[model samples]
Target chain A: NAMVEAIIFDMDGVLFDTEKYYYDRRASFLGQKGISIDHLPPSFFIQVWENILRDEYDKWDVSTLQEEYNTYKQNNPLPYKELIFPDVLKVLNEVKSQGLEIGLASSSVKADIFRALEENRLQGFFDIVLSGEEFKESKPNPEIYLTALKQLNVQASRALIIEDSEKGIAAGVAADVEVWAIRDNEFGMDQSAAKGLLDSLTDVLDLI
Target chain B: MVEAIIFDMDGVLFDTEKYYYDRRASFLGQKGISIDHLPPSFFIGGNTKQVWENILRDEYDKWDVSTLQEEYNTYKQNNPLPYKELIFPDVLKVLNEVKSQGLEIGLASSSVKADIFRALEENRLQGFFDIVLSGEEFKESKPNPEIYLTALKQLNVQASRALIIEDSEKGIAAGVAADVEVWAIRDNEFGMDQSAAKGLLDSLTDVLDLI
Candidate 1:
């Protein structure tokens, strides 16, 4: 009964282990201040963009912390091609071979989105590649997912969303699409709201 | 001469400070993490990610934020803290007054849009906001004024003609940075810095006085 036509995938922990790379940078930044990784709440990775924890560090304002974090990220950029999950391409190829539309909706900016796609030689795999930065609001708002749906001319009900974070899942749900969540328990994602839970990305091929 | 008014959510609209502190403190207490050494500034106005990052780097010695967040979220879902009860009494009255004045109203917060929508909907206050913004959408956080600036643009009002009601140092800084007149709502629970604000008000209803 799984009549899915198009499958929209969220980047980050889903297709690649980029969350681990980002965590390394965040941990390094805090480590310089003699702060260890153990003290944060379980939702830290899912909550990074919310930026509400400005005061807990050294009383630095949001801008200062952002500037430093950005510098750290630039200096210690992600080693992209290597971070791709082993099963991602196989899943994408299988889905595409099944005559289904593929879309990439990521909260990352355009540059990063394209870079990852290009690096992994996955640029031609998707019919739509959307970056959250172009929209007025990002994921958990559903604008990104809606934009992808519009571009693909696909109905939400007919689409299957693959995501790895609460925010991403929230976005998919808000868009009224049934979502299949890929588990990332190692980095602390809450995958409960997903319509279908998957232990790995390859599980997506079975669901579709 | 304000044409639009923007409100910060956490302290100005809802009495969430105590609930947040108590919950986080309790959650960390289970892990033997003591937050007594940290000042109230630690928990005030910033986004949850930054706050959790600090807690992890400074308080705990391990990294299990996702599972911890899941547990905390699960507890919250089940316990369902009384957010509706915490809605400030003056909010509706103030919103009505602003609307009657023919000014646009917007909500700009560091919280996720879903959280903002849920709170507003729970209190039946969603209709009052002409524009709602979540800082997660923006590259810059508060104190950078990006969220407020975005709100001002969306309301189609000049920064000088808009008013920002904030309850935290970071929120006030954002208001000031956006070049709008900021009214600091005094909330001792979160310990806001009022010196940078254009003026201060004891309650949300007091917003009527300055405008």
Candidate 2:
């Protein structure tokens, strides 16, 4: 049966509805400066920050803006507890019962990943938690997934990745792991490379 | 969005049911036995073990079923059928149409795993299917709702949003039992009573329009 031994999760769009929340925050921040990021794809999240730091229409100085946005986000933190997908706890618990190791490899920073997991009381579920920011290369690059698979001691064939964004799906595919994407049309992500498309995280339980 | 499409492999995709019947007849005829008495319907849903045993019931007195079955299996293995050449003309169109629409596709066949993979791999359709389940894996193959229901569950699709394309009465009955829309691909050779199928798809390409 070649049963799966480990399950790797991507946190932003998969574990939490945070991609949209982050999208709104960035849009809100940029809107204040009379700039629009509507032309960018949702996967251009990193570029949004870069665009803010050093792109055209530099109506103001850059370094001050980056720190200001950082301060703004710090003061108005996202509600991680509320942002969690309702099926997250149930799916993780079932995976636990099945004796499979769970891992989270997110493009999010280590501190943010820690905060979200703790706030949602989900820190206990993962065997390994990897932040793409700490890795040499992140999503759309196989480094994070490959490293997580090694850390969990599971082969790519015996690992399953649950992802949402286009870049994350590519990363999982590049790692040679079977990937299933949670449908998120709101982001304009092209998820065709994923092996399967699921309507909800609970559907993943049926696969196992 | 028509979330998913479930395909029956034998008659719908490969035109292999008739191919198997012909080969079986020819294989036995070479052994000085005329298996012309057996009809195409006898091999309708492609579970070879059960169907072969049933087909050999009258010959049991003359031959030991165990050894005869093994030899027949050996013959099949040695004289491999050209799987790609047997593919139905419209099958590629159907698969492509489903893919172009961003709909998920699954393979639910009563065929044995080896035969299923042979047809899939040879036809270059290996990546088109998201989930492939053999009825041999289930306690009840066709005329049972479990496999289709399981595919729907895995896809997280409701019965209303899915469609099953079948050629056998057993498969049509299973699709009906699963409460999903069923389209029976026209079978001129088998004469399967597909009355249960709500739609009679003359060809697999016809599915493109139904979409």
Candidate 3:
């Protein structure tokens, strides 16, 4: 079957279903620590937490400082990643059946990506997994996509990226890659900001 | 015999009015203060500084009153500082056309002299105007009729002979109060209310034929 040389899928919303669960867990974790978690300056939590984890802060208090982490984390809400639209499986099955190559490009840490793939029982689906931790920068930086393109030996212009946020669109645009933001009013992004908005992966299947 | 047409500088001459409006809106809105003393929605057309001072003085208590220049400098950095995208393109065309018509042009403004100078110099539009009057030069600025009246005094023109162009209700009020026929240029690119200003034009180019 004549098909795309390689496909890149965003992990959370595009492949698995854990975005909402992660957000809820984070919120609950903050609340249990007696932290009100107000005004952490959007996306500051996740960004800062990543920085902290990268630096390997010894004895970082999950109980008291969790509020600060939560505040920053909510700034860049990676959509829930557990239950993908049912059609995603059908689309993936078809893509694999055609012998088209596939890869997972995610802003998630390496361990989290493996866990999500393991949960969905899709560990065998991807030929490559590009996690944010593997690169110097993540989405919106285009480093992940550039790294994936280089690793897969695929040209960027011909490749398609499945993303869910403006940051992802920005990343794809910066890298000169074709991008489609997929969601069926399921996530809360400003629709007009995306390169092309899609309802589901089935809609993606319709696009060349 | 009106051989030379005198114009209000901010809204009439160039793109300064829109930039002022946007910076004012962002700064004021973010301050989270009451909008009560805005002197009706139509007052926005007045000279820039006068309208701003009037709004701050009237709405805010004496304790809340602060230096307008400092406050403006803080949020007004978007226009020519840190960013330069705030200016409109048609402002230059209007200035050149008016100059080509052999009309002796004068600028009557309600902004601080420094701001007008900086905006013009940075945009390279300082050579266009024959006269630039800062509202501070007048004992009082717009909505009180003093700024425009003072402008005519400096330019030595009668009110009927001079046509004023403005973009805010306060400017129109200033013109009307001074008995000068005012053209309120409606612009929203800078995010000011259109209906509030008297005569609305889509762009400065829109008024080129009329001028």
Quality class of the docking in candidate 3, CAPRI style: incorrect
How far in Å is the alpha carbon of B54 misplaced in model 2? 86
Error of 2 at B193 (Å): 84
TM-score, ranked from best to worst: 1, 3, 2
Give candidate 1 misplaced runs (Cα > 4 Å): A1-208, B51-53, B58-61, B66-79
Q: Which ten residues in a row have the lowest lDDT in candidate 2 chain B?
A: B34-43
DockQ (Cα-based) for each candidate: 0.01, 0.01, 0.03
Better of 2 and 3 by lDDT: 2
lDDT of 2 by residue, B129-200 (tens): 999988878887567798899989888889999999999888898899999999988866455678899889
User: TM-score, each model?
Assistant: 0.47, 0.46, 0.47
How many backbone clashes are present in model 2? Answer: 0
TM-score of 2: 0.46
Cα lDDT for residue A150, candidate 2: 95
**What is the C-alpha lDDT profile of model 1 across A1-208, one tens digit per residue?**
5588899998888888886667676887767655456656446645353343444645546565565555444434455666899988888999999999999998886656755675577877899999888889976899999988999999988999999888899999999999989876676677788887888888888876
Runs in model 3 deviating more than 4 A are: A1-208, B9-19, B29-32, B36-64, B67-87, B187-200, B206-208
